[PDB]
Amino acid sequence: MVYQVKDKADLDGQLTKASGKLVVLDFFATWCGPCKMISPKLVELSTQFADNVVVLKVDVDECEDIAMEYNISSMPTFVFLKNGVKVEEFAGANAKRLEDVIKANI
């Protein structure tokens, strides 16, 4: 249930559509090794929590405006939004942190 936003407008639409569910933003790149290692674990968690969580992927190279808005420096960066509140954020391919943070926000 992972969807790649095409631009800022599309993200804003996806945010409003997600309503009160936890949104996980995965800031990634196609050249980023750790981003790909965590990819399968992310996909799993999105299916596992389909009825509570929306996972959006943001290719930093494609949506440079969004990466800049969220001040991405490290990759992957997971940003967690709930009703417009940026509730948590961390970076790195830390499977346990990713799972803990999701569960902590549902």
| HEC secondary structure over the chain | CEEECCCHHHHHHHHHHHCCCEEEEEEECCCCHHHHHHHHHHHHHHHHCCCCEEEEEEECCCCHHHHHHCCCCCCCEEEEEECCEEEEEEECCCHHHHHHHHHHCC
Cβ atoms of residues 93 and 38 within 8 Å: yes
What technique solved it?
X-ray
- Give which of 27, 36, 32 is closest to 59, Cα–Cα: 27
User: Cα separation of 25 and 54, whole Å?
Assistant: 9
**Beta pairing, strands 2-4 & 53-59:** parallel
For residue 63, indicate whether it is catalytic. no
**Where do breaks (C to N over 2.5 Å) occur in the chain, by preceding residue number?**
none
Catalytic residue among 11, 35, 63, 98: 35
Distance between CA atoms of 16 and 49, rounded to whole angstroms? 19
End-to-end CA distance of the chain: 17
- Cβ contacts of residue 102 below 8 Å, gap of 6+? 22, 24, 45, 49, 53, 80
Catalytic residue among 5, 18, 32, 54: 32
Task: Say whether 35 is catalytic.
Answer: yes
Domains of the chain are: 1-106 (3.40.30.10)
Cβ neighbours of residue 2 closer than 8 Å, sequence gap 6 or more: 26, 42, 43, 46, 55, 56, 57
Q: Could you tell me the CA-to-CA distances from 29 to 49, 72, 85, 87, 104 in Å, in that order? A: 24, 11, 25, 23, 26
